[PDB]
Amino acid sequence: EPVDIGTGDFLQHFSVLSLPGSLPLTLSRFYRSQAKGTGIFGPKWTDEWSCMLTVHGNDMHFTNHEGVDLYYRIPQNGIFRDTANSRQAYYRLSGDIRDELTIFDRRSQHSQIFSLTDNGIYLLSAIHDRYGNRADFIRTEGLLTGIHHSDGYTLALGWQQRQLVSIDLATPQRQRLVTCHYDKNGYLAECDTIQFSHLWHEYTSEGWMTRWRDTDKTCVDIVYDTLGRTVSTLSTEGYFDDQFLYNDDEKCTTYLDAEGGETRYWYNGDGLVTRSIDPLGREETSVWENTRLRSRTDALGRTTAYDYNNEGEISRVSLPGGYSLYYDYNEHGQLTRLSAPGNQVWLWEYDGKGSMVCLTDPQGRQQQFSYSEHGDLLRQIMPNGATWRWSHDALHQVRATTAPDGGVTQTEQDILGRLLSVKDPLGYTTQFRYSKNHAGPQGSVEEIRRPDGVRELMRQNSEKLPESFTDGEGNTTRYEYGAFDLLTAVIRPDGERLACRYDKLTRLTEITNAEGEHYRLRYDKAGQLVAETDFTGRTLTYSYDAAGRCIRTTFPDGTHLNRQYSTTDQVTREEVAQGDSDRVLSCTTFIYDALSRLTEARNNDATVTYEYDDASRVTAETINGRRTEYNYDPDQDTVSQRTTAGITECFTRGLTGELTQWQIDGHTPLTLEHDLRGQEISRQSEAGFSLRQNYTPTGMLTGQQAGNNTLQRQWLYDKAYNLTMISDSLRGTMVNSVTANDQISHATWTGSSDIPMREERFAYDRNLNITRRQTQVNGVPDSEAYQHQQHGRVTSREYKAWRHTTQFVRVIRDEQTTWKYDVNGRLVEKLIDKGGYRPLRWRYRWDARSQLTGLETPEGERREYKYDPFGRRISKRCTNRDRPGTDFHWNGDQLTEEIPVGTDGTPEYENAIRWIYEPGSFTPLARYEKGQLHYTITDTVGRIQELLTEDGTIVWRGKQHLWGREEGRNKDDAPSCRLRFPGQYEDEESGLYYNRFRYYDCEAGQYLCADPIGLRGGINLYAYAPNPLSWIDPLGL
Ligand SMILES: [Zn+2]
Quick count: other Cβ atoms within 10 Å of Cβ 1? Predict the structure, then answer.
């Protein structure tokens, strides 16, 4: 809101200073072009430190920090008592006009004290809270020259010729906070603040601001009509080339935005909008009662109603759909009860000072809060008795936190609230040091010293935006900005550039990657994104209803994905149609109960149902008749028990919610220990299995000891936290060299010989996608591949392999792979061609949602995959060969069961393999098949490296190439393990890693189709990760 549509005023509001404390001291400056008021910053600007009360006959005028005048009728005896103005009912005026006057703010529980000066004018002399924390305002020769805060600091305000030039912290430390200059007519021409903006302002003779600018890129020119109304704005970089039209007889203002849209606002006598029409003709109406909003109705006709109690607070909100929210307050305006649908009631209790001492949640569980006499929160007790404690420094900022397990965290902040140091419960200290640039453009440097010896530097520019970041290895990422703090470029440590361009309303319209290709976004007049064209040239088009809800996605092949919504903005139906035919190809339904909770999702291949308790916790998820049931800890709302097909698991948790015991199906329990930083140091079973883990000073996993029953593993990182060494008692030593982009360029595994057993050498293109992969085996070249991306996706690849003969090498393989994508960006064919041989061709079939529904192998075998309404693959079948299938059970996003299906289509539920996860975790803890329990040991990315029996016997060992190809050789009777990176499952018929929403090729390092969430997943629509030992992608997004 730069322009007040009801009056034509140009409006600005900027933070000036914000000091921490028991009673925070914050100052802002508010500008209105037609304003008649004044503040410490001179005419036209108002502020919190210049509020006043004025006698004007029989009423008292209250001028607030925005220059708004509120009227209070003076009683005959001249004594106010909880006197309210109906326009702003939360302000309560008390006191004898012969003594001193108090404005109490019911929203904040804070009070302003006004003292008689001259001519029946009362100036602000103090602000305080209900604890006596107080800021005293000192005026000399009529000017505010000092402030004393009861926390123990003072400010000094410096004036020259009755113009404020400086605001300083005076004691206990000297610090300039604000510096001001003025134009020839006394208007504020420049305001430099230490914590926020540094701006310049230009004005006409009347004080109408015709220009404002920041330190670098932002400069805006404003034009007024002769009546002082804003008629246009324009920045020097082209943004917000806007015009304003006025109609005083119709009471309708028109906003002509820079991209051709037209918005009309009808307003009432108080200048409040009663009817607006957006650039698409969509209409919104509001009903007002003395500045209080009584109802609003959107473009679909959905009405929200507001009721108020006798004290002026919102007492009831009627939401569309018949839902009501009820609010109750104590005598001071503090919220004591919130009643929501489903008989959900929140209760708050306050003591005599207004401290919230007891919260009762909708389940009737109580949290207790204890406070100091100055209002510091000292202690919180949770329903299960978990107790948090805090102590504070002289500015009442937290300096020590005692967690429920007794662990103490030490924090230190400066007078401006910047963090200076943290010491965690194990005694490891991280330090922060700040320094201001003195030469050149006014900027700053923040240095971070970490307890593992890592040093990082973050630089800010003159706008206090991040300018560069230098990691512990000295690699620097830089940032560039245009006007209005728009990020226009990111420069990687290797010097490659990512760039962004915006339209005249600052909507992102173009992204250019390091390769130099463009991603384009297109908007309608209301700012809705109606089209995007990715780097491949693929365009998706979007349609919207009157509420801005997206109701159709159109794909290049002509298929449409139609969506329907409930009154509460929930998807009730999804339809697939194609081309101009309105014929529905497929249909998906979503059913919701009376509380708008999802109870059933259904497509052609799966019905998924959910059951809820009164607390809206999920007590059961059922997929195609297979039911998982949950029970919950009554104090923590964590899963305490889950049962599927008569197999029950029990979870025991400590005060912090950490897992202390896990048990399945009457087996010996697994017990777990955690350190004072909440990190797991051991898991044990009395049967014999034992795993101990240790961490770096910054909490990186760095050590594992277990105990064909003994494992010793060490992980070492560089100062940028790339994993550069693995010492593995079962595998050898892995050494990784990294690029400036934190990608691994050389990965070697070494045994007891100096010559490495195997090496991978990688190169990457400008987009960081794989190009070269060379392997060596025992020091001699083994294979070499070179793959080529076009528009960010692998398109072809050459591969050779060598045989070591006799000291020479002869080529034994030489083949080219080509990839073909359809117009929707999905891989439909991968062709491997070695000269003189039969071709090896994979074909891929896809549905409208870009789910891989079919696969054809080079030998002609056909597989079919089916998916539930949430993209979870529920089945796999071979349709033309005598081969078994698989059914899949899920809990939420976790694959919990693979169920073998015989060739006749009969599921073998007794042969199910259960993968055990903590609820909502992607890191597997155990495995249960045919009554046999195995425990996992996982690596730094949560991938299983070993499976162990209950007594600790190692019966499965993984062995991988960098990008995930698993080739570990294990005994015939070893348990199967098809899990790979988090959320991945290897399909043995293809070698693909199924990865929830997409399939992953661990050779090319890429997914087989474009990211279904587009740019929301990053700018590399096919990549998996820049470094598979540092990043994960469990949903395939
Ligand atoms: Zn008056």
Answer: 6
Token look-up 């070695």 returns: 834
Domain limits, the chain:
424-495
**Half-sphere exposure (Cβ direction) of 68: Cα atoms closer than 13 Å:** 10
Task: Give the residue among 896, 952, 407 at the shortest CA–CA distance from 629.
Answer: 896
Q: What is the rounded CA–CA span in Å between residue 488 and residue 624?
A: 49
Binding residues, by number, are 56, 59, 61
SS3 letters across 486-541? CEEEEECCCCCEEEEEECCCCCEEEEECCCCCEEEEEECCCCCEEEEECCCCCEEE
Asked whether 370 and 390 are in contact (CB, 8 A), the reply is no
Cα dihedral sign, 849-851-853-855:
positive
- Dihedral sign (CA 766, 767, 772, 775): positive
Assess contact for 904 and 887: CB atoms under 8 A: no
**Degrees to nearest 5, angle at CA 342 with 340 and 346:** 40
- Tokens standing for 866? 């089916």
CA distance 187 to 189: 6
Phi, psi of 11 (to 5 degrees): -125, 135
Smallest CA-to-CA distance from 279 within 525, 489, 67 is with 525
Let me know: does 70 contact 54? Beta carbons within 8 Å: no
Is-cis flag, bond preceding 341, omega within 30? no
DSSP-based helix, strand, coil % in the chain, nearest 5: 0, 55, 45
Ligand 1 mean position to 74 CA, how many Å? 11
**Which residues, listed in sequence order, are joined to residue 690 by a DSSP beta bridge?**
684
Ligand 1 midpoint to CA 57 (Å): 6
Between the alpha carbon of residue 766 and those of residues 197, 492, 513, 520, the distances in Å are: 37, 11, 9, 20
* Residue 669 DSSP code: P
Method: X-ray
Query: Which protein residues have their CB within 5 A of the ion that is ligand 1?
Result: 56, 59
Please give the Cα distance from 653 to 101 (Å, whole number). 55
Pairing of β 91-96 and β 998-1001: unpaired
Q: Can you give the length of the chain in residues?
A: 1037
- Alpha-carbon distance of 22 to 1008, in angstroms, equals 56
Q: Compute the distance from residue 207 Cα to the ligand 1 centre, in Å.
A: 26
d(CA 47, CA 757): 72
The answer to whether 104 and 95 have CB atoms below 8 angstroms apart is: no
Instruction: Enter the DSSP assignment of 385.
Output: -
Residues in a beta bridge with 79: 96
Residues 6+ apart with CB under 8 A from 580: none
Q: How far is the CA of 354 from the centre of ligand 1 (A)?
A: 34
CA of 70 to the centre of ligand 1 (A): 9
Query: What φ, ψ does residue 727 adopt, rounded to 5°?
Result: -105, 115
CB under 8 Å, gap of 24 or more: what pairs does 422-429 form? 424/677, 425/676, 425/677, 426/675, 426/676, 426/677, 428/697, 428/698
The Cα–Cα gap between 1037 and 1025 comes to: 11
